[model samples]
Target chain A: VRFSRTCLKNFFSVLLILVYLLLMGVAVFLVYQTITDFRDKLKHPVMSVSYKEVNMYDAPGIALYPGKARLLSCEHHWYDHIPPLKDPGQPGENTCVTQDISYIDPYTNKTMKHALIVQGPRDVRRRELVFLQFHLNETKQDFSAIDYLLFSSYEAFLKSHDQVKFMQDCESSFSSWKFSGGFRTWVKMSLVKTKEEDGSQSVEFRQETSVVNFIDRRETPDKGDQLFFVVFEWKDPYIQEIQDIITANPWSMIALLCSVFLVLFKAADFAKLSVKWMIKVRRRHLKK
Target chain B: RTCLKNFFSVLLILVYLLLMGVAVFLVYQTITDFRDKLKHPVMSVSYKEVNMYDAPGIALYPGKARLLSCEHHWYDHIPPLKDPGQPGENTCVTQDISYIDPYTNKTMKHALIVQGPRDVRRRELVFLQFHLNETKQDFSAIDYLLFSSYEAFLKSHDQVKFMQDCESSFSSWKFSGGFRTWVKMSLVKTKEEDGSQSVEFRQETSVVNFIDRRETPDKGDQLFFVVFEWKDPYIQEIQDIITANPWSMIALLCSVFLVLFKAADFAKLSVKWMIKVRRRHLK
Candidate 1:
């Protein structure tokens, strides 16, 4: 009977130790998970700001509807000045050249002639501008304005066309603007690049326009010899780009986790020692 | 053995008491920090009715353009123009002046515009019409910038200079020809450490082209239309404050300490019981 009781007591002690061991295991596992989470957060910090520098930008395509109006003169000029026209309605020079490509409008799926494939301004400090001059004969249409669209680049325009059934898909994708007849429309464009969390990239353009009236010196005002002047210039010297940055410190978190485990162990040791000492005191008292 | 047992018992009690003291200090420190945090919250949020907003001033550039009509309107009821491309009437109150741009040193034209409704709850908006006779310049744009208050803009020349500096520095946006630009504005005020407050205007714009149905397109008279409106009827009021509950923290600390001391007593009693059983068996 004595042996059996001793065995039972020993069994309970072993079970208590086992349960404490299990608790220690749980604590270690929790610390490991916390450290991993901290490290992961450290690698991908959120909400940080950075600035990027670039010398040149990729070319953007400008689509124009010449319609009844003929593209008389397209010239690349620097310093944003178009010298007063010596004569209105008469073609002065054809310095600007463009390529004609057929692109199917994605929304309508109808192919149309997309014109004006010009390069975006480079070395913006020099202030490059594309000055276009158009002359329209008697316009019978209700609105005397030319509709235009701007796409990301000429290369993307070509690539879209090369892809079967996807050519000029951007025709329907980007919003189109209009330039009223008898006025000069100067469009200053800024490029914005956005990089999403999934590492995908998108390019968008923001434009500011200033319109000035053009005086025609034709013999008859009823002839409808309307001269349309339009210029495109880069809004600023820099491309605005956005990127993500992560914000957690792993070492600090690791230290905090270590302190938690150390405290837990110290508490367990203190409890065990207190119980052991009490047991000793009771045995001595009984013997006395 | 009795002396050793007594010594150990005193040592155990002292260590337990020391642990309790440490726990009490920790609880106090935690509560103090919690109270401090609650007293100063980082951000506070509130909603306000939109009509309470002060009227904002609209400044349009290109000195030649005339404000044809300015009317207080509501909702999105844009009536088709009776005469699409022709100048209708000059009823808008406009202040036209030419100020020499300090940076460019060239005199630029400006028209300070004030036209809007006081009823923001019903989605009141300000509709403005402008006419620009064709000029020698290449671009057909009415460069415009918005400021929060007309009185503030009028009261300070420094404000005008500041606006010019902002326009040149921040890539001034423009309303192009033959389109109606709808501008929705919201005001944000920030408080600095010196107790000084600064107000900022944030805007979102949507543009759509208007059909010019004139039988004879006037080669010179180009019309520009714009609308300024509040994006929503609610103003977001934000404040920074702390939100710690002292009573809850105190209760938690007290319960934790009590439970810990109870656990220590129970452990001591269990050990004593075990020792008595062992001693009896040995006898």
Candidate 2:
């Protein structure tokens, strides 16, 4: 039959050529799968959450964008109590370490609409509260509520070399909120700390405010300049910290690299030995 | 002819040795890559918005207690107490459910189920009043447990088992007597690895001292007022995401298999070519 040495070796050599050719199809399929696996993992990422409890929180920075409005009074109370309102028409006692910071408006492009920057509530466990009253001494027909912005730390704000850029950056980043002038808005503040994959730190304050309608006690009863009363307090001591981490390793690089190098060296030695031996075999055949 | 076979076998040995070295490094890397995945998992943090929220289940544990009144109010404000120390009109849909605890299995419980607030625009709140009678031995509060969804408890099978599992997971809180405790709650959802979700609540409360207006000076009865509302409209959702690129493992497997096959085919092809080249020289 076909069991001779020459026929069998020739036949196996032919068969192996087809085997090498068939491996070409496997390469295409493997490449397709390998590319798709990387894409799927690249799309989905992961996150974890935990909370850090504190004894006292840092005083938050406040930007009260009072449009043509003047601060009437600023008071801090320890017992979480607000006494009876005396007179709505007249301004109350001003006790805050108040700073009047003004910048050219970013969104409106107006020249210096003056805003009130004041102290925020710090020691929540000690029942620290900040009561503010603003008098917008202008009569308007539409509903007018003064908008304000809140940043993480006022101490950091005071330390900035360029206060103009600092305030402008706040206007771009922070979300603005408002409270009605007539009602007494009691705001509860909570902190959320954010850490991204690149380890960028962003802190946001979320609020839940409840309002009480003011009982008008003005003697003359002339409703002209609207007065705004708002009290700020911390909700809890725990700060919600959310994190997203991206960790990828590259150990497989070693395996593939070393394997390719070894394969090449082994093939070189085998080919060199073969060609040198063939020179002797051909010379022996020629002499015969 | 016999000599040819012996020479070919030596070539075959070298080809096999190449594949052996290839497999060693690849397998070492493959296992090391798997080890890293176990320790370093990827996180996917995302927020989802929902206009409608599933009604949360609010269950109360009132021993020697009776529900005096349960009324639904809109916004953050509630009307003044029209009827005090009296069984006022009941306006809320409540269910009387009883179950045994899963941990002990023998400890039976009597629970009152009140549906939580859902209509968020008007800022829905539920004002609940409870009056306790007889000799009070323990404390000045009634315990309450909140489940993630009321419909999950309602449109579910094995009500007792559902509550039993609820007790195992959810925590219980209390409100004080002679006080109006206003609890504001926010929802946080976390996604697990197994395509399941876990729902939890973050609550903040403010307490106002209630004036005792009851005529009787006896110590038999006590009143507890609780108002529950949503903290805000926005829902916070988070997930753990995996951000691994398979290119490292993929390229390794591809080359390992490729080189092994290529090595064996290389030997056989070299042997045949040498045979044919010598044949031409002899002819």
Candidate 3:
């Protein structure tokens, strides 16, 4: 009986050690995974841009020039006679190019230009340049169709005046475009089209843009023709900026580092607590 | 003997309750922290207007413009420099944007454009924009610079390119530029004189086309140099994205749950085994 009791005690010690090792392993793995994931997120960046319905063909592509242009196409034709833009089997028409452009600027603060091209079918195929111009007059404008020949078109006029003006009117743009408001153009584009051999023509060349917030739908035109719709989206990013600012704080890093020690200490304390509880239960059993 | 037995039973119950309370408290604390992190914004988004080649399907302001047959290709890796002969870190490189199929809320992976004159102290600015909501099309992008050293930037940049190539070389789509790549220009007002003092400014600014990635940028807050970066305030939308992504709040919650369950199971089995050994010894 004495020998068996000694053996039992030894077995229990071994079991306890085994369980402890397993728990430690799990804790280490969890902490490791957590740290690695956070590190990757910090090192890499991800952002999104979205638009309402857009012309599928007018996507942005690489530009051989100093800059590239993104096309936001809307399938709704003001002409009211044209067919809604879409593939034969597709449900809704793809319209205008809504795009987000990411680039490093001369300054430290990263700058981005939110741009949209609300285009209908049968528009001219030419390069269009959009610039943000702020002048001494305290006036701001988003200049589109600067390079395109059809600047005389009503749609181009509306785009250059109202949309550009609205962007400039915003407090952010007003501040960012303060210096080069004169020549700060956001996007430029050159449109090229290829035709099929038959008399019936088809769009052969399409450029893809980095687009976000695309809402696709079809609607009946007021003029007895069907229409497809697209709209540009905008939002404020103030809170995100604050978080980024705080991440660089020394205190934040210190806290993150301390968490590792905290986890280890907590685990050790819990183990001791469990052992005490087990001892108390064994004493109770002896009393009974 | 019966009185002693009753006292011990009461003590055991009290100790068990205390242990259970600790376990519950730990679980609750972990859950609360996870929820806080989920509600926080991971990063900010900004927009810049690139020409058709730079960003296809971009609106040139408010006009009706059309492009024909632009193919949509997805990329999960960074692209290499177009011209191996170019000077500076990267010049003449473009990357394709990638998205998931069937479009549910998922973690977004992008093939960054990693070439063409990326530098610090140059007029060139790197920006990223985030889409904030599903109902309204809203987004914010901010400007950031390469705060790291030139050598480190080059190393990390090149390493990213190699990694991306290894992953997405088989089905890559290249954008044909009907436009040009690099332009050299000088800044007229090099330095801005503030109330306190003046600082040295860069004479020349090289505008490079590349995607700059950032996390937790600010809203209308100046990061460096009196420049303000904007942030989007869609805390809930961001939380949803985190819940859907890998290594996110959902994963954290699940981990805590599984750990607690394992701990309880282990304790019960151990106690049972101990009781059996004691009974055998008594026999």
Candidate 4:
């Protein structure tokens, strides 16, 4: 009663095996689909740019990497006009607010660099500018360039205890730029925001420099004096928010798998019922 | 016996009903999950670095005006005054494009299209000096716009339509006369939901007044000097990210099938053992 030799049993058994085979085949397809979809998404990261509007910007930090060159004076001016060089090589009145940073230059084999960190432009509407005058008395070379860097906040630099370490990180993160000597390097800076991989907000700077030759007028023209005029201003009142949004949702996949497993459980119950039904039919026919 | 057969038959039919019911719901749930994924896709941001830029296109609207001089200068280095208000030299490659405004459908306008700066590291700039002989208006300035690619505009079949599209998308800027308007342009490219690419310019312009040392008789003649250079060699690319992982989903699904298969096998084995035990009592 528990077994049968009928062709129906064999036929049913073969059909059940085929059905299971196809179900497993469908499972294989789903696995393939998921892998390919994930790989394709991994190839590209989704990013977008939004310009954040603002009337005033937080004061940025300006780090100057001047080697053996003395900062003659630091002044703040408005209306984009700096009164022509009052004295070419002398230390004049310092109007602008400034901060000093003594940090080891990361790129220059850790040779100590006596750097100066000055406050950057804040009011984009008023056309505020930071003017730095640098003079190198002794010159062995024909041309000299001063490397400077810009960071997100001047206040952050002031707040930190380790100014050198703060500056050290800034140098590694930001790009180093150059403004040549004997020219009025007019730099307009724009703020940019980048989201880190940990999904946190950050700020960066991009600038455009327009240099004009300084009309050198000295009673006794000193051949060794190299005077550099550099002005920093805000490019625009808007800050660019550049960040990427991750789209792959883990919850979605959970629901997707949930439905499939439920469907499979139903299938297993149906297959079990068929097995019992066939055994019952054989048992009735076997009774003598 | 008839009652017994009815009992067995109804039990089998009821089990099938329950089994089919779950199947129908599971099928519906999975289908909706798939449908949601198609229309909506998550956001991610990545920066693609570039050493050089494709030459951008600059279009300027100069009515009754002519370009006096266009010269290439590197690192903001331009030579001393060379005969003001006169055509000194032309070194930039430029052409003309005539197109009607698409939305307004108004009178045709001519745009002086110049190939933009490419030497980003050297901080190269193209300085243009435009002179307008006559203007009746109280204040006159040349309006301008910059698109991403100059080569694309050249290869475009309906060049008029291409220029027209750019005029609508890109914001039109102005540079006034009797002063030098230096524009430093930075580009931000956005990828739209419809799989289309669009660009915008973050513009910073510095205006410096030129000294006019002429009599009242020569008061009307205007000269406009403009410089176009990259704000910096930085490109911002925005796109959307899909956060779903595939192999993990597959692994989850595998457990479901494996568990069901093993459970069903044990269920069949138990039914067989019951049938054999019941037959042993009959013997």
The top-ranked prediction according to lDDT is 4
Model 4 chain A weakest lDDT span, ten residues long: A137-146
Over the stretch B1-283, how does candidate 2's per-residue lDDT look in tens digits? 5476557768777768876787877788787877787677655655666676778888888887788877786532526556566786788878877788767768888898988887566667888888777554646777888878887777888998888778757668777775567787788888889989998877876555343432443665677888787766777776665434454555566576766777678877777777777677668
lDDT of each: 0.63, 0.71, 0.32, 0.72
lDDT of 4 by residue, A1-288 (tens): 224475767867876787677767876676577656656666775666788889988888887878788878877777756454576667867876776656576654566776677887778888877778888875444135677888888887667786777877877776566676656788888888877777778877778778676676553655556677888888888878876654456676566666566656666667767878877876776764
TM-score of 3: 0.23
lDDT of 1 at B67: 63
Q: How many residue pairs clash in each candidate?
A: 26, 14, 112, 17
TM-score of 1: 0.48
Superposed model 4: Cα runs more than 4 Å off: A1-6, A44-60, A63-195, A198-266, A284-288, B1-42, B74-76, B101-106, B192-194, B199-202, B212-218, B241-283
Query: Alpha-carbon error at A181 in model 2, in Å?
Result: 22
Q: Which stretches of candidate 2 lie over 4 Å from their true place?
A: A1-32, A35-39, A46-95, A98-118, A121-202, A206-288, B1-33, B76-78, B213-220, B233-238, B241-247, B250-283
lDDT rank order: 4, 2, 1, 3
- Docking quality level of the chain pair in candidate 3: incorrect
Residue-level lDDT tens digits of model 1 in B1-283 = 4455556667777878888898879987897788678665454334456555676666777566766666564444535455553455555545645555766667554556564443456556767777777777666788777665666666677755756655543345677776677676776655554667656667766555444545335676677777776766566554343234343344456456656867798868755765576677668
**Number of the predicted model whose TM-score against the real structure is largest:** 4
Q: Quote the chain B TM-score of every prediction.
A: 0.65, 0.72, 0.25, 0.69
DockQ of 4: 0.09
| DockQ in order | 0.05, 0.11, 0.06, 0.09
Native interface contacts retained, candidate 1:
0.02
Better of 1 and 3 by DockQ: 3
